[PDB]
Symmetry: C11
Subunit: 153 residues, 11 copies
Amino acid sequence: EAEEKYIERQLKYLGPISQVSDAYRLDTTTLKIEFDDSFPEVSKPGPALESVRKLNRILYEGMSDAIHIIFSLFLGFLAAITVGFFMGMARFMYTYMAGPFNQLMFLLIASLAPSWRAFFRAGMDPIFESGSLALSNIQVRLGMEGKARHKEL
Amino acid sequence: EAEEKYIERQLKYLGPISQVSDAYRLDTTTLKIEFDDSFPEVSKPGPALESVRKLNRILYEGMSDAIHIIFSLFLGFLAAITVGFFMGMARFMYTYMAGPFNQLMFLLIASLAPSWRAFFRAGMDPIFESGSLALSNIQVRLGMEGKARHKEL
Amino acid sequence: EAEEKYIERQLKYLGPISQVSDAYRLDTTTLKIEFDDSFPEVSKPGPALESVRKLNRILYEGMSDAIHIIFSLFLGFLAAITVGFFMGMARFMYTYMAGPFNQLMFLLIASLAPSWRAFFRAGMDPIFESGSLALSNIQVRLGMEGKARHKEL
Amino acid sequence: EAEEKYIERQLKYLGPISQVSDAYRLDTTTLKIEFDDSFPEVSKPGPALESVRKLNRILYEGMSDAIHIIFSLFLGFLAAITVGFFMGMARFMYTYMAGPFNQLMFLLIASLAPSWRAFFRAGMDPIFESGSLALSNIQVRLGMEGKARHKEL
Amino acid sequence: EAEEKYIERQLKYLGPISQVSDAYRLDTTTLKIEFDDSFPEVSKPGPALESVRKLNRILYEGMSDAIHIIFSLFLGFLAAITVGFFMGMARFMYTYMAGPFNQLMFLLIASLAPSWRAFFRAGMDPIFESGSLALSNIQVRLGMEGKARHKEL
Amino acid sequence: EAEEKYIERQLKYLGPISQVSDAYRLDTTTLKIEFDDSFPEVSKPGPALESVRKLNRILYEGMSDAIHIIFSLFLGFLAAITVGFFMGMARFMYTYMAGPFNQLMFLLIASLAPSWRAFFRAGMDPIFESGSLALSNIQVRLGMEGKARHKEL
Amino acid sequence: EAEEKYIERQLKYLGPISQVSDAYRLDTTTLKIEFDDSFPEVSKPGPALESVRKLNRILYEGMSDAIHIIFSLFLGFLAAITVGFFMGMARFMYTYMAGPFNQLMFLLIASLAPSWRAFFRAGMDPIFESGSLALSNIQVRLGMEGKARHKEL
Amino acid sequence: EAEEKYIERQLKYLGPISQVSDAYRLDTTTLKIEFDDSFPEVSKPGPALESVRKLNRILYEGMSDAIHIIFSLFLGFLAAITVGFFMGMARFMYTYMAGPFNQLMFLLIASLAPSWRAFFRAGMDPIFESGSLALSNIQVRLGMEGKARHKEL
Amino acid sequence: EAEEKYIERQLKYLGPISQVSDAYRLDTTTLKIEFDDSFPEVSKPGPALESVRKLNRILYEGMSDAIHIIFSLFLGFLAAITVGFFMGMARFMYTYMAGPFNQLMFLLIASLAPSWRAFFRAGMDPIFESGSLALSNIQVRLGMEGKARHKEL
Amino acid sequence: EAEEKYIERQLKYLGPISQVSDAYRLDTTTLKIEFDDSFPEVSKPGPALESVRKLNRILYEGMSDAIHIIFSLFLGFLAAITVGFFMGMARFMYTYMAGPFNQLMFLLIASLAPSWRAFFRAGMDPIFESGSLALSNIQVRLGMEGKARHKEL
Amino acid sequence: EAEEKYIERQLKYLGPISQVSDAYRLDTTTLKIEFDDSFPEVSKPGPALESVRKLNRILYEGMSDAIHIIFSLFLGFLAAITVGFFMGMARFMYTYMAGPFNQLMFLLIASLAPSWRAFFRAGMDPIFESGSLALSNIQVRLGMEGKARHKEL
């Protein structure tokens, strides 16, 4: 069962999956809060132990949901208002103060850089043109043996 | 028997299997608690030793299951309640206090970074544009011999 | 649902995606300010919790939009004028003072560099022509085994 | 004989075989306790020496099995009970104390990490964006000679 | 919309794009001075905010263009004349003083270099002919498994 | 003769042959104790020397086999008994004392590791996400020439 | 428009373009002295600004060409004569003094080098023949998965 | 003649030939004791020198064979007996004392190693899981030109 | 025009072009002494400037050729004689003194080297046979995705 | 002529040619003692110089052959006898003293090594199993352009 | 003309050309002693200068050949005799004194090396078997895009 579904999921897409191109992400997607994950089992229960598991499951989940509901209703109500106020101010500041500052800084930088680039390169490039000659004159001799078998499915 | 099933399992999927992309995982899946694994044997028993193995197996497993059942029933019932309370509070705090803090921090960071990026790069890039010339001017001469045999199955 | 659309998006283009060739960019595209992202949830709500989520959503979004509207109307109006003045001056200076300076600097640099290049290379090149002989005389012997299976879909 | 079966076993599967992905394994599978392995021979015996080998084999194996049977019957009986007790307690503790602790630790960690990630990257990334320019501007010239022979079996 | 056009643009040409072969270039092509870029928005406006955006846009752009026009007309007029004078002198000097100096320097250098090259190489080459023997005698054994699936579109 | 059989043996299997995956092996398979190997010859004997070789062979082999037979019969008999006793005890201890200890140690370790993993990674990972940007922006230009000849056997 | 012609120019030739094989070259080909390049613009002008651009263009270009013409006629005339004299002398010296000196130096060097080469190699080569054994005994096990899609245009 | 047979011998098998997998081998196969090898010639003799070579050959070979025959007959006779005695004792000791010691050592080692492995890895692995992120995010752009010619023989 | 001929010249031969295999070469082939190269122009002349260029060209070239002719006739005549004398002596010495010395040195070296080679290798090789085991036991798992488009011209 | 035969010889076999697998070889094959090689010429003689070459050739070769013949006849005669005596003794010692010593040493070594191997590996291996995790999690994105031309001869 | 013949010569053979396998070679093949090479010209002569070149050529070549002829006739005739004497002695010594010494040294070395090899390896190999585990567990994810164009000529 499990391994078959796992292999089916692995065979759909074989390419890269990294997420390093985004620096402003949360970690919430990895967490798992559920009875089968919070209270792991080392080997398969028998029917004599399944009843105990069954009782404990409802106790745990009922308590966990009750507390969350109560706190969300009677304290989240204030948190939403309070966070909304500061988030509105933050949006205003981002639009009307940071962007213009960054654009003006870009203009001030882009007018000086070319001369420094040219000046440094004109003086330093020969040292690496000379060093380039070390990777000329590569020469390889190769010999091979091989066997192959193949099938059509 | 065993090696054949092992090879059959190996030939289904030949790709990568690492799990480094998840930093919040448990190690429970690797453990094996069973008589044939807890009391290993160096070579195949004969029928004169199988009887002793048979007696010891039931003794071990019966004791192991009895203790676990008793403790699960008379002490797990309290652990479930106690853990549920704190887990409810933890969920509330994660939703209503951490997320807003992180989003506000993201807004405060994203408004300063571009200028530092531009300023550093404008001053440091030429040093690596000059160093790039070392990998130009590669030149290779190659010669080959080969034999091959193949079959259709 | 979600994983299928993700895989569909991944399979359209498999090439490089980096943006290092631009040094004057903002980070705004990565941010996400919305209730479902500002107040994350660790596991799927049930219908008893969806109502609380529903109330909190409207409270948060209403406050956030109201503050932004008011500040944009009664303070952004002055910011636009003030930034426009300095941006006009910045454009004039970029066109009529920086460009000529950079072009004259280019002319002054390009008239001296060739002699320094020739002088340095004539004295330093032999040291890397001699070092080039180390990568001659490579010789490889190789042997291979292989099995393959394939399908047409 | 032997080399042929060895080659037949090698040609079934040519892929990786390492076991580094499991950190909780025993070494029992490598051991070999048998007369032909415990008392190795440097060269093939003749029929005059096979008789001596034959006598020594039965002596060794009989003694070895007798001692193991006696100790397994009259001492393994107590070991099974004693180990079963502690293993039951160990299972209970693993399920009802370690898992909840680890999950709560995960929740406490996952709420702080994003801000540290963003803060560090925003300050350190440009230093490696600048260094990336060294691997641009690679250029290769290549020339080849080749001979090949092939067969269908 | 946007991602589709982006992918269409990416699929036209998949080759190298670097510009390191030119050391005398400006950075003007990367800049973007426009209201939608100078005053970025974190999420899509609604129609109640579009009106405020609409007013601010015309204010900003009108002021920015007016100042630039006035300064270009009443100060760029003098800048053009003044820069033209010095640029004419610069062209004359580049043609009639730098080029001859560089050519004469080339002649003076090219008459001495060959002897230094020969003298250094004759003394230093053996040290790298001896070191070349380290990359002889490479020998590789390789085994492979593979599965493949393919389609015609 | 000899080289042909050597090449025939080499062409059967061309894959890897190392044995590093087993840490508990003996070296007996490499030894060769025989007259033609114990008393090597630098060049092919003639018939006048073959007679001397023939006499020496029987002397050497007869003495060597006699001593081994006598010692195996009158001293190996005791060695077999003595080693069998200790090997029986060793098997008992391996089964009934080492395995349980190792399994209990596994349980004690596997309950602590996840938290340390998460804690270390959450603090250290950004330092290597930043360093990952150095291998972006690789760009290659390549040109080729080639000649080929081939045959069917 | 522009990007299409750029891509058309890029697709003609995809090979190496470096110029490191020539050490006696000028940098004139990279420079661009023209009004559209000397006085860059950050964004497209409108028709109200095109008139100002039009006036400034003729002023700049007229002044620049006038000064260059006058100086070329009344001072380049003497520069040509003066440079011609020294260039004639330089050609004579290159032909009749440098070449013979270099050829005689070649003869004096080529008569001593072989002995030094042989003497050094005979003493140093074994040290790198011994070190060559480290790259024998490479062994690889590989496994693969793959999907492919293709089209004819 | 010679080069043709050399090339014929080289073309039979093109794979690896190293012998590093055996640590208990002699060097006798490389030696060559014969007149044409003991008394080398720098260039082809003429018929006037072949006669002198012919006389010297028989003198050398006759003396060399006579001494070897005499010493083999009158001293090798004792060497065979003496070596046979010690070799018989050596075989007995190898079978009946070393093998059991090594097997018992294997059992004593294999019972302790797993715990040390698990303990070290649980503490040290995260440091290399974090370091693994440096080889993500590789991105390559490549362009190619090629010409090819081929023949059937 | 120009770029088309450049590309036509680049597409004829795509292989290596280095000249490091010759240590006794001159640099004359790189130089360019002509009016269009000695007096470079930054941008295309108009017909009003072409006349000035036309006058200066003839002045420069006439003077340059006159001086060279006169010096070649009235001073090269003596240089040829003087250099011929010393070159004749140099050829005689190269043939009749250097070659014999080098051949005798070769004979003296080639008689000592083999013993030093054997002696050093016999003592040092094991250290690199042991180090060879580090590159055994390589194992790779790979997975791929791909899209392709192609045309016949 | 010459280059054609050289290329014909190069195209027969394109594989490896090194000789590092033999440590007991002489260098005689590289030497060339002949008038055309002992007295080299820098450029082709004319018929007026061929006569002088012709006289000198016979003088040199006649003297060289005469001295060698006389010394070979009247001194090589004794050298052959003297070397034959010691070579006979050397062969006897190699067969009847070195081989047995080496075989006995092999037996003494092969009985101790396995325990040291196991003991070291059991303690040191985890340190390199942990370090193996650094080469997991490699991820590559690649894009390509290509042109090709081909011919049948 | 010239470039076409150069390219024709380059396209005949594309393989390795190094000569490092021979340590006893002269450098005469690289030299070029001729008027067109001894007295190089920077640019093509006109017919007014060709006459001066024509006179100088005959003067130089006549003097150079006369001196060489005279010295070859009246001094080479002694050199040939004198060198022949010593070369005869050198050949005799090479055949009858160096070869036997080297062969005896080979026999003395080849009898000691195996024991040192075995002894060192048995103690040092485990250290590199343990280090081999670092290159296991490599895992790669790859994705590709490609375009191709091709022609038949």
